[PDB]
Amino acid sequence: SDLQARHAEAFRALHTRPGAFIIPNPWDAGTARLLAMAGFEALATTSAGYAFSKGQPDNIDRDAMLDHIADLVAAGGLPVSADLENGFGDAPGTVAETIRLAAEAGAVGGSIEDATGRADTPIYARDASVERIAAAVDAARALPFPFTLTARCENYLHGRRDLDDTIARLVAYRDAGADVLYAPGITDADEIAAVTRAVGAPVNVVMGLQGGLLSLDELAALGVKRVSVGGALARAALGAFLRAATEMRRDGTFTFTQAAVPGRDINRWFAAPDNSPI
């Protein structure tokens, strides 16, 4: 991969052109392929989608994720932003190593969140959080291509729905060198517009995780740059899977198969040596 450097630049450029773009979240090679064929320009991994595929609830082994990143890089042929949880450890050096490893696995971007995993103290202290992002940035800037670092503030997922602390963290992460800022759980249009105005740098908003829905155009008008979907695609697939299971158990019928992608089509598409829209 001089390919990696090409993807890195293409990915960074998605963030500076006008409008917002969607970064969808496959959880296996198949889905990665299909999203490229659909015309998406980047992919993001989903620790949640990945977990559901393994029959586990959300929250992951670093080595398992590194393998997963490499699988989706190979399959998709697109730039991949990796969900790297909290960097798989508390210490800044751990976060930094995680960034290097994720790049080595082929990612051209990734996210580091400020959730500790400890219910007592579910969000890292501001100082410690910023030091963490600073270490991630230094690792990112030592790479020989532009690595797009997303800094996550997890406040709204852990009962601290405080807009002002959340903005302050994101601003502090931006000032530490983060390229993209993301607060999952903020869904209100007015709250989102205040985030994007205060942050200025690119903001990612996730759709379908909680609350209400906005379109990509609505989000662009609120100043959002990137829109992701976390585990929602995996959960869409699973909702259809469950409806089929239920039909079979309750009725003994298979009409669910009528809306399935025909075998003939998917075998043709996956027989191709690339993911050309087609």
Residue 150: closest CA among 225, 244, 83: 83
Map residue 158 onto helix, strand or coil: coil
121 binds, among Mg ion, Cl ion, a copy of itself, none (CB under 5 to 8 A by kind): none
CB 238 within 8 A of CB 49: no
Nearer to Cl ion, 51 or 137 (CB): 51
As measured in angstroms, the least distance from the Cβ of 184 to a copy of itself is 11
Q: Does 24 bind a copy of itself (CB under 8 A)?
A: yes
* Residue 115 φ/ψ, nearest 5 degrees: -90, 130
159 forms part of the interface with a copy of itself (CB under 8 A)? no
Residue 94's binding partner among Mg ion, Cl ion, a copy of itself, none (Cβ under 5 to 8 angstroms by kind) is none
Return the residues of window 67-86 that contact Mg ion according to CB under 5 A. 85
- The answer to whether 217 is annotated as binding is no
Beta strands (DSSP E) in 163-265 are 180-182, 203-206, 226-228
Phi then psi for 110, rounded to 5 degrees? -175, 170
Closer of 104 and 217 to a copy of itself (Cβ): 217
Q: Is 276 annotated as a binding residue?
A: no
- Interface segment toward a copy of itself; rule CB under 8 A; list 102-110, 112-120, 172-180, 227-235: 227-235
Concatenating the DSSP letter of every residue in 47-98 gives HHHHHHHTT------HHHHHHHHHHHHHHH-S-EEEE-TT-SSSSHHHHHHH
**Is residue 189 close enough to count as binding a copy of itself by CB under 8 A?**
no
* Chain positions contacting Mg ion, by CB under 5 A: 47, 85
Bind-site residues for Mg(2+): 47, 58, 83, 85
